[PDB]
Design a protein around this motif. Sequence first.
Motif, PDB file in Angstrom:
ATOM      1  N   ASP B 275       0.802  -1.213   0.000  1.00 53.99           N
ATOM      2  CA  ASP B 275       0.000   0.000   0.000  1.00 53.99           C
ATOM      3  C   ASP B 275       0.838   1.267   0.000  1.00 53.99           C
ATOM      4  OD1 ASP B 275      -2.071  -1.730   0.043  1.00 53.99           O
ATOM      5  OD2 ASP B 275      -2.633  -1.360   2.139  1.00 53.99           O
ATOM      6  N   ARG B 276       2.159   1.148   0.020  1.00 54.15           N
ATOM      7  CA  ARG B 276       3.015   2.321   0.015  1.00 54.15           C
ATOM      8  C   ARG B 276       4.263   2.044  -0.801  1.00 54.15           C
ATOM      9  NH1 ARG B 276       5.074   6.231  -1.084  1.00 54.15           N
ATOM     10  NH2 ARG B 276       6.598   7.423   0.140  1.00 54.15           N
ATOM     11  N   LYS B 277       4.602   2.985  -1.674  1.00 48.25           N
ATOM     12  CA  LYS B 277       5.836   2.921  -2.450  1.00 48.25           C
ATOM     13  C   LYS B 277       6.706   4.066  -1.954  1.00 48.25           C
ATOM     14  CE  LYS B 277       7.522   3.145  -7.275  1.00 48.25           C
ATOM     15  NZ  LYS B 277       7.176   3.317  -8.707  1.00 48.25           N
ATOM     16  N   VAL B 278       7.735   3.774  -1.166  1.00 50.53           N
ATOM     17  CA  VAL B 278       8.359   4.795  -0.332  1.00 50.53           C
ATOM     18  C   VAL B 278       9.526   5.385  -1.099  1.00 50.53           C
ATOM     19  CG1 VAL B 278       9.276   5.349   1.900  1.00 50.53           C
ATOM     20  CG2 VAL B 278       7.802   3.332   1.633  1.00 50.53           C
ATOM     21  N   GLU B 279       9.380   6.627  -1.534  1.00 46.72           N
ATOM     22  CA  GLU B 279      10.494   7.317  -2.156  1.00 46.72           C
ATOM     23  C   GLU B 279      11.422   7.916  -1.114  1.00 46.72           C
ATOM     24  OE1 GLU B 279       9.027  10.426  -4.514  1.00 46.72           O
ATOM     25  OE2 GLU B 279       7.569  11.046  -2.990  1.00 46.72           O
ATOM     26  N   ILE B 280      12.677   8.086  -1.504  1.00 43.44           N
ATOM     27  CA  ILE B 280      13.672   8.733  -0.663  1.00 43.44           C
ATOM     28  C   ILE B 280      14.462   9.646  -1.588  1.00 43.44           C
ATOM     29  CG2 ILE B 280      15.555   8.377   0.959  1.00 43.44           C
ATOM     30  CD1 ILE B 280      14.315   5.496   1.267  1.00 43.44           C
ATOM     31  N   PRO B 281      13.982  10.845  -1.848  1.00 40.92           N
ATOM     32  CA  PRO B 281      14.694  11.732  -2.766  1.00 40.92           C
ATOM     33  C   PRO B 281      15.975  12.233  -2.150  1.00 40.92           C
ATOM     34  CG  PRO B 281      12.939  12.917  -1.716  1.00 40.92           C
ATOM     35  CD  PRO B 281      12.787  11.488  -1.281  1.00 40.92           C
ATOM     36  N   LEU B 282      16.755  12.850  -2.907  1.00 37.88           N
ATOM     37  CA  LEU B 282      17.850  13.415  -2.144  1.00 37.88           C
ATOM     38  C   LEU B 282      17.366  14.604  -1.330  1.00 37.88           C
ATOM     39  CD1 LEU B 282      20.681  13.102  -4.707  1.00 37.88           C
ATOM     40  CD2 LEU B 282      20.502  11.975  -2.524  1.00 37.88           C
ATOM     41  N   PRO B 283      18.012  14.832  -0.197  1.00 37.27           N
ATOM     42  CA  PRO B 283      17.662  15.993   0.614  1.00 37.27           C
ATOM     43  C   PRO B 283      17.845  17.260  -0.191  1.00 37.27           C
ATOM     44  CG  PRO B 283      19.050  14.485   1.820  1.00 37.27           C
ATOM     45  CD  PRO B 283      19.051  14.007   0.420  1.00 37.27           C
ATOM     46  N   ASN B 284      16.968  18.226   0.049  1.00 38.20           N
ATOM     47  CA  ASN B 284      17.117  19.479  -0.656  1.00 38.20           C
ATOM     48  C   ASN B 284      18.313  20.220  -0.089  1.00 38.20           C
ATOM     49  OD1 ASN B 284      14.515  19.674  -2.374  1.00 38.20           O
ATOM     50  ND2 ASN B 284      13.816  19.043  -0.341  1.00 38.20           N
ATOM     51  N   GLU B 285      18.671  21.328  -0.732  1.00 33.17           N
ATOM     52  CA  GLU B 285      19.645  22.230  -0.135  1.00 33.17           C
ATOM     53  C   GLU B 285      19.238  22.525   1.299  1.00 33.17           C
ATOM     54  OE1 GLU B 285      22.488  23.074  -1.202  1.00 33.17           O
ATOM     55  OE2 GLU B 285      23.032  24.941  -0.187  1.00 33.17           O
TER      56      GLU B 285
END
Lengths: 38, 358
Positions: B275-285
């Motif tokens: 039920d969840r597709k967990v993204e981990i983007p890079l941290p922003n500035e």
Amino acid sequence: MATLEELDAQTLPGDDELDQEILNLSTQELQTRAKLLD
Amino acid sequence: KLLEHRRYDDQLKQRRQNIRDLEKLYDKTENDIKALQSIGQLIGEVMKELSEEKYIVKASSGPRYIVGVRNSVDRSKLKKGVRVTLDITTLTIMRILPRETDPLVYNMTSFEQGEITFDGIGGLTEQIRELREVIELPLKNPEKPPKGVLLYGPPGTGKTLLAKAVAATIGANFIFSPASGIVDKYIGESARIIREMFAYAKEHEPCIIFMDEVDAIGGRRFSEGTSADREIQRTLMELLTQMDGFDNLGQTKIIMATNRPDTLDPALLRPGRLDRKVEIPLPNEAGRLEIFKIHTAKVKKTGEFDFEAAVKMSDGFNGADIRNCATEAGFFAIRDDRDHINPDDLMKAVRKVAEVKK
């Protein structure tokens, strides 16, 4: 003033008994130690 | 003349004390000595009870056998799936047993909660909250429970750590799953593995189930031909069976892990499984600077150490890359003799960190 001397003297053989008899109690199992092991 | 009392008591005290020092070890060893008579007794679960005595029991070592009870045996208690001690020659029950299997901390990997909470890796905070609510809470609010949650992005960014940080927050037993061991070779062992992972957890619930980067035991395979892929598909499906099947996450929950999501069975991604597709983007500035002063500044550093300008040059980094930034300057630190990182150590690293990749 020599009583406790002879008194603490008569302890030693009875004291010694303890270790002297356990040296029996030692070997008794010390064998069985070595025995069932080896 | 009076020196004898010592020489009396000297011997005496030790001697009388040396009594059981020696003597203790005998009986203990003797037990060990003795216990060598105590002999091993086979194990199995009752498949069923043919008659009160007559039992259908598959040997925990091997095939089925028709057996009887023995003694101290409760033909009452004897029941399907019940682990029992079994006999080597008589081949009957040698005892009735509790049960559990598998290396809980190894084949299963059993670690309770997680090492550092969600906050320490903070800057993933979107997920941090977002996952917690869809993972931790649905327990404590009876008002679907969630099927599954799949990390993706670069691992360990806090990413792999998330799981622990995840695992920490709930109280459930975090159960880590690496893949291929679940079907090394080992020409079988699938559900038995996973269901122990299920059932132990199912009994030991709350439990967190975390399956590492599951593309060897996960994913849609290849031509979907047989490399032993048929092993994988099964294994691939064994979860599917526990997921699209009635097996729920009672108090035990499942974290799916991948570094790339698109690497997985489409059917796996499905609700009823995930039920969840967990993204981990890079941290922003911001997220960087956020994580920056988090991962980094907690290593001893000067205020001289350059906080934002590093972040300025800090771009497209992950949570550990941030740590690399620290760790890299640390080279220069130990190279500059710094417990406190100095700005010197830093931006050399920062570019150097921004060097190899973005």
